[PDB]
Amino acid sequence: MATFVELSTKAKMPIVGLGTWKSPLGKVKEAVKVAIDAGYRHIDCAYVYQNEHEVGEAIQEKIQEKAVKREDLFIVSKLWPTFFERPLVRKAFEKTLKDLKLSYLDVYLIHWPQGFKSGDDLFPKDDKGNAIGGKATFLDAWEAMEELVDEGLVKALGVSNFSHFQIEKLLNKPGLKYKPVTNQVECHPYLTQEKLIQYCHSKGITVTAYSPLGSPDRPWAKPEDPSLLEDPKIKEIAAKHKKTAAQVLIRFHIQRNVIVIPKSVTPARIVENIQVFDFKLSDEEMATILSFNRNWRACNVLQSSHLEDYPFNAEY
Numbered sequence: 142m143a144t145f146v147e148l149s150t151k152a153k154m155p156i157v158g159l160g161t162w163k164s165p166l167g168k169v170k171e172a173v174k175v176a177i178d179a180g181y182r183h184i185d186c187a188y189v190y191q192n193e194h195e196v197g198e199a200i201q202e203k204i205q206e207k208a209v210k211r212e213d214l215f216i217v218s219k220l221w222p223t224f225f226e227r228p229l230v231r232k233a234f235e236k237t238l239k240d241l242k243l244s245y246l247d248v249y250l251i252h253w254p255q256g257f258k259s260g261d262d263l264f265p266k267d268d269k270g271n272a273i274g275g276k277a278t279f280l281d282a283w284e285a286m287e288e289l290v291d292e293g294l295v296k297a298l299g300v301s302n303f304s305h306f307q308i309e310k311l312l313n314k315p316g317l318k319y320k321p322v323t324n325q326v327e328c329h330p331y332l333t334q335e336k337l338i339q340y341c342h343s344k345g346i347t348v349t350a351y352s353p354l355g356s357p358d359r360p361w362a363k364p365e366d367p368s369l370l371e372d373p374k375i376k377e378i379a380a381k382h383k384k385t386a387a388q389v390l391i392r393f394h395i396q397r398n399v400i401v402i403p404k405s406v407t408p409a410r411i412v413e414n415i416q417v418f419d420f421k422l423s424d425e426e427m428a429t430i431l432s433f434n435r436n437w438r439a440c441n442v443l444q445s446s447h448l449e450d451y452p453f454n455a456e457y
């Protein structure tokens with residue numbers, strides 16, 4: 142059982158959640174089942190992961206067997222950028238809700254600020270693999286998502302992979318009924334997101350950290366790419382508390398009041414990843430970790446720097 146972070150809607154969002162990116166079918170259902178048993182009350186989902194139907198089976202099992210009540214679960218999913226056109230936001234949202242077997246979501250995020258070519262080709266690209274843009278923007282999608290909140294099919298909306306520039310574009314839209322409650326971005330000691338976090342909090346927006354362990358199993362990894370779990374300075378700090386480097390990397394976010402969503406389908410690691418409320422990193426250990434900032438992204442896979450709202454060019 143965890144601390145939470147309060148949203149501007151006064152809803153309470155569990156500070157540690159289970160990530161499900163790349164969680165295979167046949168493993169993800171058991172993954173969710175172990176996490177809930179382990180005290181995870183927050184599960185992070187997406188249409189684009191193409192496994193929400195199996196996540197929905199697991200959640201439903203545990204509500205059935207009285208292990209957890211819906212009101213105490215905090216379920217998040219994401220709208221993919223080939224569905225920014227208006228009838229498609231509703232259709233994409235309905236498939237997510239149906240696969241998840243839920244009556245409502247706690248938060249619905251814009252997964253990526255750049256519209257891609259509309260439709261169920263989720264990664265439209267040219268011959269060189271560059272993203273094919275669509276004409277609908279994240280503003281068009283937000284307007285459509287706002288309807289879902291009006292209807293009580295979504296408690297709150299948020300953003301993911303937004304720069305402060307694109308949040309400014311959102312917050313400064315005339316006519317906006319709802320603001321985002323969170324901005325979910327990659328964050329870890331190599332990419333500490335200090336300005337963006339300071340920006341989002343100043344605006345009442347929480348931050349959710351994905352890839353907190355450096356997403357080591359990412360298929361596109363180079364052996365030259367730095368590894369956080371094998372980092373001696375991260376390992377020194379883990380040794381001090383007799384915890385794992387992984388436990389240190391998750392706790393780092395908790396002590397910044399940043400929500401963090403480590404992904405696992407391995408039961409022993411799922412449990413390990415939430416045993417982070419019986420120790421504390423010192424201000425000096427925290428400052429050492431923050432010094433490791435390299436401005437290095439493990440996830441920069443969409444070859445899309447050529448379309449309009451690219452988030453990663455900007456300083457923050």
Ligand SMILES: NC(=O)c1ccc[n+]([C@@H]2O[C@H](COP(=O)([O-])OP(=O)(O)OC[C@H]3O[C@@H](n4cnc5c(N)ncnc54)[C@H](OP(=O)(O)O)[C@@H]3O)[C@@H](O)[C@H]2O)c1
Pocket residue numbers: 159160161162163185186252301302325326350351352353354355356357358359370385387388402403404405406407410411413414
């Ligand atoms: N908003 C976005 O743009 C976006 C994009 C992608 C993902 N996400 C979300 O963020 C979540 C998590 O981030 P991520 O999947 O990028 O990478 P991550 O959570 O940093 O790392 C996942 C990898 O670390 C392993 N691992 C987990 N716990 C470990 C431990 N205690 N010791 C050693 N290894 C451990 C996992 O292995 P096993 O799984 O084999 O145990 C997996 O290979 C995703 O599941 C997804 O829900 C968001």
